[PDB]
């Protein structure tokens, strides 16, 4: 179970926007750390909407199972604050924020080598999850957080972490799921209980498309009815103009879940490039 954090030890500062039934804030946590030393630590506070408190079990279940695993490319959760009427996840604050935002802001400056490094790191994280038979269920560029920027001067690559899953697609309303096409795979639109390890291979493909597409969101021009028909017609996403990962994207986004490559195979493919 999660460490319980007192509301009195948390200060809410600026809003970072809204997620799926959540409000996100930057905050400060006062804590006693190692050696009895007092700290004030920057934290990310995820607040489940009061109106959607029926989703709290899924909201926290997500975080919990993954926080039972420690991995360098997985975001650290510090604990929960369940004081009063609020349900709050207290998470590590990742300095450079979401990859999708970063891709759009720095697109002129991002090259294939940076992209490959980030893809490899994401694949490493997903391989670890696969090995542990843990389904993430919401792999996407917004849910990849940049801990550190590339520094050519020192040969340091960028470094990312994958955030928590959030409320499971197995409990979310149909209209939200449809809006999340083409991250949610076709079999999960058919039946959200089809959530499986193969789910994350599909979403990984979509995420690679994002990584190659400068922060663009695939199929954003299609309304929900048209996104449904896209899957009914068995279309694939267009190749990004920077096409180096296009074959890998299509191999991951295979309409037959059984044919989607293992993360081991994905990593081998990535290692074979530039
Ligand atoms: N750990 C973090 N550190 C720094 N910024 C973060 C962190 N997590 C989220 N953010 C910022 O908060 C914004 C909202 O995040 P996001 O949309 O993932 O919310 P969510 O509650 O996780 O919803 P979903 O389940 O849809 O992902 C993001 O764009 C991101 O920049
Ligand atoms: Mg998120």
Distances (CA, A) of 229 to 32, 63, 179, 240: 54, 33, 12, 21
Q: Are residues 65 and 143 in the same domain?
A: no
User: Which residue among 16, 59, 159, 166 has the greatest number of ligand 1 atoms within 8 angstroms of its CB, and so is best to mutate?
Assistant: 16
Q: Which of 88, 185, 89 is nearest to 137 (CA)?
A: 185
CB atoms within 10 A of CB 264: 12
Please state, in angstroms and rounded to a whole number, the distance separating the CA atoms of residues 46 and 67.
15
Please state, in angstroms and rounded to a whole number, the distance separating the CA atoms of residues 234 and 249.
15
Distances (CA, A) of 45 to 84, 122, 136, 140, 153: 15, 23, 20, 20, 34
Q: Are residues 76 and 136 in the same domain?
A: no
CB burial string 10-37: b at 16+ within 10 A, e below? beeeeebeebbbbbbbebbbebeeeeee
Choosing from 40, 74, 93, the residue where a domain stops is 93
CB atoms within 10 A of CB 191: 9
Nearest atom, ligand 1, residue 140 CA: 27
Q: For Cα atoms 80, 200, 97, give the angle at the middle one, nearest 5 degrees.
A: 50
Q: Which of 43, 154, 140, 149 is nearest to 88 (CA)?
A: 43
Q: Are residues 136 and 35 in the same domain?
A: no
- How many domains does the chain contain in total? 2
Q: Are residues 88 and 98 in the same domain?
A: no
The domain that contains 39 carries what CATH number?
3.30.200.20
Choosing from 93, 111, 140, the residue where a domain stops is 93
The residues near 100 (Cβ < 8 Å, ≥ 6 apart) are: 140, 141, 142, 144, 210, 215, 217
Structure tokens at 139: 């792999």
Please state, in angstroms and rounded to a whole number, the distance separating the CA atoms of residues 153 and 143.
28
Structure tokens at 145: 């957080």
Q: Looking up tokens 């795979």, which residue turns up? A: 185
Please state, in angstroms and rounded to a whole number, the distance separating the CA atoms of residues 121 and 97.
16
The residues near 70 (Cβ < 8 Å, ≥ 6 apart) are: none
Q: φ, ψ for residue 166 (rounded to 5)?
A: 75, -170
CB 196 within 8 A of CB 240: no
Across the strands, what pairs with 10?
29
Distances (CA, A) of 212 to 31, 160, 175, 216: 40, 16, 27, 9
Structure tokens at 135: 């389904």
Q: Are residues 58 and 74 in the same domain?
A: yes
Q: Is the peptide bond before 165 cis (omega within 30 degrees of 0)?
A: no
Q: Which of 179, 202, 195, 203 is nearest to 254 (CA)?
A: 202
What is the whole-number distance in angstroms between the Cα of residue 261 and the centre of ligand 1? 28
Q: Are residues 174 and 268 in the same domain?
A: yes
Please state, in angstroms and rounded to a whole number, the distance separating the CA atoms of residues 211 and 140.
10
Q: Are residues 19 and 152 in the same domain?
A: no
Which DSSP letter does residue 149 get? -
Q: Are residues 48 and 155 in the same domain?
A: no
What is the whole-number distance in angstroms between the Cα of residue 36 and the centre of ligand 1? 31
Q: Looking up tokens 């750390």, which residue turns up? A: 33
Closest C-alpha to ligand 1, atom 17: 19
Q: Are residues 193 and 210 in the same domain?
A: yes
Q: In what order do the strands lie in the sheet with 10-19?
A: 10-19, 22-32, 38-48, 88-92, 77-81
Closest C-alpha to ligand 1, atom 6: 97
Please state, in angstroms and rounded to a whole number, the distance separating the CA atoms of residues 211 and 209.
5
Please state, in angstroms and rounded to a whole number, the distance separating the CA atoms of residues 81 and 84.
9
**Solving technique for this entry?**
X-ray
Choosing from 93, 110, 130, the residue where a domain stops is 93
What is the whole-number distance in angstroms between the Cα of residue 165 and the centre of ligand 2? 7
The residues near 117 (Cβ < 8 Å, ≥ 6 apart) are: 150, 157, 158
Q: For residue 62, give its domain range.
A: 1-93
Distances (CA, A) of 12 to 86, 216, 243: 13, 31, 43
Crossing angle for the helix pair 112-131 and 197-212, to the nearest 10 degrees: 170
Q: Are residues 83 and 160 in the same domain?
A: no
Q: Are residues 238 and 252 in the same domain?
A: yes
Nearest atom, ligand 1, residue 98 CA: 31
Q: Looking up tokens 């893809």, which residue turns up? A: 119
The domain that contains 239 carries what CATH number?
1.10.510.10
Q: Looking up tokens 């998470």, which residue turns up? A: 91
Across the strands, what pairs with 92?
43
């Amino acid at each position: 179970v999660f460490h319980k954090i007192r509301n009195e030890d948390l200060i809410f500062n600026e809003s970072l926007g809204q997620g799926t039934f959540t409000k996100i804030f930057k905050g400060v946590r006062r804590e006693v750390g190692d050696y009895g030393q007092l700290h004030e630590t920057e934290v990310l506070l995820k607040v489940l909407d009061k109106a959607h408190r029926n989703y709290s079990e899924s909201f926290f279940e997500a975080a919990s199972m993954m926080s039972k695993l420690s991995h360098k490319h997985l975001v650290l959760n510090y604990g929960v604050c369940v004081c009063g009427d609020e349900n709050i996840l207290v998470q590590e604050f990742v300095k450079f924020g979401s990859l999708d935002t970063y891709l759009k802001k720095n697109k002129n400056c991002i090259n294939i080598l940076w992209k490959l490094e980030v893809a490899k790191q994401l694949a490493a994280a997903m391989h670890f999850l696969e090995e542990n038979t843990l389904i993430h269920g919401n792999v996407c560029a917004k849910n990849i957080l940049l801990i550190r920027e590339e520094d050519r001067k020192t040969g340091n690559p960028p470094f990312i972490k994958l955030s928590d899953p959030g409320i499971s697609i197995t409990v979310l309303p149909k209209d939200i799921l449809q809006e999340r096409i083409p991250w949610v795979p076709p079999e999960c639109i058919e039946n959200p209980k089809n959530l499986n390890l193969a789910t994350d291979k599909w979403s990984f493909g979509t995420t690679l498309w994002e990584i190659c597409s400068g922060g663009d969101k695939p199929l954003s021009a299609l309304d929900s009815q048209r996104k449904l028909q896209f899957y009914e017609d068995r279309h694939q996403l267009p190749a990004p103009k920077a096409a180096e990962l296009a074959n890998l994207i299509n191999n991951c986004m295979d309409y037959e879940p059984d044919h989607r490559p293992s993360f081991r195979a994905i990593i081998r493919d990535l290692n074979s490039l530039f």
